C-alpha cells in the first residue's frame, strides 16, 4: 500500500518477527537484544546505514548509547556492540516483493541470518524455509504522524511553529491551542517526501526558495520547496530534524537561536544545533 | 527509476548477472541453461509464478516449452525441466532495495543460491559476499516498448488496430501505414500500467466502461479505462494479451472473431482465443 517502509539508507525502523506484529526487536541492556512487546520507545527503534561497496547495512539502536547489531563470531548469538565497523556488523536486507518480508544476512558470513525463537530470543542460524527468519520493516515516523494533525515544537524553548495571521510567515510562538500551530502531516507516495499543512488555512508548510531563506505557508500547488524530509537526530529518537525535499541541506531552523515569541523560521545549512531541533507530538 | 522492474507474479524478464548487463539467463537447450549474449530469443525471457505459501516462485522459459529452473538435487547443476512443483523449483527472489540486485536462493535447500562461473555457466552454491551471486531483473515489455511507437496487430489475420475517421470507434484494418493504426505505449509509474496513445490524435485507447463493451479513443482524461496491462501470452512470448486497469478480466478482443475490415474491437471476458492475441511491433 505505501513505499513508505522500503529499505532507505539513513530511515528508523521496527524490526518485528513476520509471525507478529505486536513483537519488535528490542535493545534490554547494554549488550542484550531480544524481541519484545512493542512500546514504541527509543530502544525498539533502528537506524539503517547502508554502505554503496557491501551492499549491506549496520543496525544501530536509537537510544542515544550508537551501539549496533552485531554477530558475536564465532559463537551463533547476537549483541549490541561499539560500531567497529566489522563484516560482522553488515547486515545483507534483502526483500521479497509481494509479502515484504525480510531476510537479515550477516555480511561476514552469509551463511547465516538472524533467526527468532520460541523463546522471543534471538540467534544467528543457516537457512531454511522457516518463518522464524523473516522479519518486517515498519518506518516509525511514518507510523506515529501519516494522516495525523500535530504540534511542533522547537527544541530551544517550549514554543510552537506558528503562522502569522496577516502573513503567510512561519515564526516559533508560545501555546494558544490556535489552528495557526497545529500542522496535518501527510506522506506523499511519489515524492517519498511528507507535506505539513497548516489547519487555519489548508495550505503547506513552504520554504520561499525563490525569494530567500524564508518559511512560511503557501497555495498547494505541490511545487518542490513544499515538501520535506522528517528524520529523528541522527542518534536519538527523542527530537527530528526537518529538511526541504528542494534541498537536501537546508534544514528547519530557528533564526539566530531566538528564544522569544515570534523570533523567525527558517531553512538554514544543516549544522546539528539545536536550532534546527524539534519535538513533533501527534494530536 | 522505474517500479516497472519488480519481481511482480506473472510479469516476464530477463535475468542477467549483475558484473554484465549484456549477458541473460539463456535456455540454450531441451535441459540446458546458461549465460548467453542478449538477443532477442523467447529462450532468454522468464515467467515468474508465485506461490503465497512458499514466499517463492517458479521461473519458467517462455520459449512455448513450459519448462521451469531447477535444482538437480542431490548435484549442485541446474537444469530446465518439466514443472512438477518440486521444492527444488521453487525459487526464493530476495532484493536489496539500493542495488536492486537479487539473490535466487532454492526453496527447497535455502543454504543454496543460484551462481554464475567466469566460463557462464551457472550452478547452485552455499552463500559468499561475491556479486557472482548476484543478478538483475528487466521486464521484456517495458524494455521492448516503453515510450515508444508501435503497430498492433490482431492473431486473427494481418489486419491492425485503427482509430476509425468519422467517430471515436476503434476496429481492425488492413495496414494503411496511417497515423491512426500507430499507437505509443507509454508506462505509467502511478497506476502501474500502459496508456496507448493513437498517433493521429494524442488520445488514449479507452474502454467505454460504463456504457457497454467497445473499445475506442478518448481525451488524456487520465481515467481507470484508459489503463492496459500488456504481456506475452501465458506460455509463449510471441504474442501479447492486453487487458483493462479498470477490470482486469477484460481483455482486448476482436468480436466474434471476425476476419474482415472494420470488425469491432472491444474488450471481453479472458477466455485464451486467438481473439485475444495481438502482435505488438515497435516502429
Known amino acids: 500500500q505505501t513505499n513508505a517502509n522500503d529499505l532507505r539508507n539513513n530511515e528508523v525502523f521496527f524490526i518485528s518477527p ?37 551492499q549491506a547495512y549496520k543496525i544501530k ?66 537457512q531454511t524455509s522457516s518463518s522464524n527468519q523473516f522479519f518486517k520493516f515498519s518506518n516509525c515516523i511514518y507510523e506515529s504522524f501519516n494522516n495525523s494533525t500535530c504540534k511542533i515544537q522547537t527544541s530551544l524553548t517550549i514554543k510552537f511553529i506558528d503562522k502569522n495571521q496577516n502573513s503567510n510567515n512561519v515564526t516559533i510562538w508560545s501555546w494558544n491551542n490556535g489552528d495557526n500551530q497545529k500542522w496535518k502531516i501527510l506522506y506523499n507516495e511519489s515524492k517519498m517526501a511528507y507535506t505539513l499543512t497548516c489547519i ?7 520554504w520561499f526558495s525563490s525569494i530567500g531563506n524564508n518559511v512560511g505557508t503557501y497555495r498547494t500547488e505541490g511545487n518542490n520547496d513544499q515538501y520535506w524530509f522528517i528524520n529523528y537526530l541522527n ?6 530534524t526537518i529538511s526541504n525535499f528542494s534541498n537536501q541541506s537546508k534544514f528547519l531552523d530557528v533564526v539566530n537561536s531566538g528564544l522569544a515569541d515570534g523570533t523567525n523560521v527558517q531553512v538554514w545549512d544543516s549544522n546539528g544545533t539545536s536550532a534546527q531541533k524539534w519535538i513533533i507530538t501527534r494530536l
Open 200 to 206: 487555519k488555512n489548508n495550505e503547506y508548510l513552504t
Open 61 to 126: 539502536v536509537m537510544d542515544n548509547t550508537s551501539l549496533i547489531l552485531t554477530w558475536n563470531a564465532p559463537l551463533s548469538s547476537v549483541s549490541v556492540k561499539t560500531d567497529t565497523n566489522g563484516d560482522n556488523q553488515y547486515w545483507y536486507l534483502l526483500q521479497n516483493y509481494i509479502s515484504r518480508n525480510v531476510i537479515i544476512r550477516n555480511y561476514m558470513n552469509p551463511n547465516l541470518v538472524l533467526q527468532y525463537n520460541i523463546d522471543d530470543t534471538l540467534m544467528v542460524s543457516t
Open 235 to 240: 542518534n536519538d529518537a527523542s527530537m527530528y
Open 18 to 54: 513476520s509471525n507478529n506484529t505486536n513483537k519488535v526487536l528490542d535493545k534490554i541492556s547494554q549488550s542484550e537484544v531480544k524481541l519484545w512487546n512493542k512500546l514504541s520507545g527509543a530502544n525498539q527503534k533502528w537506524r539503517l546505514i547502508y554502505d554503496t561497496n557491501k
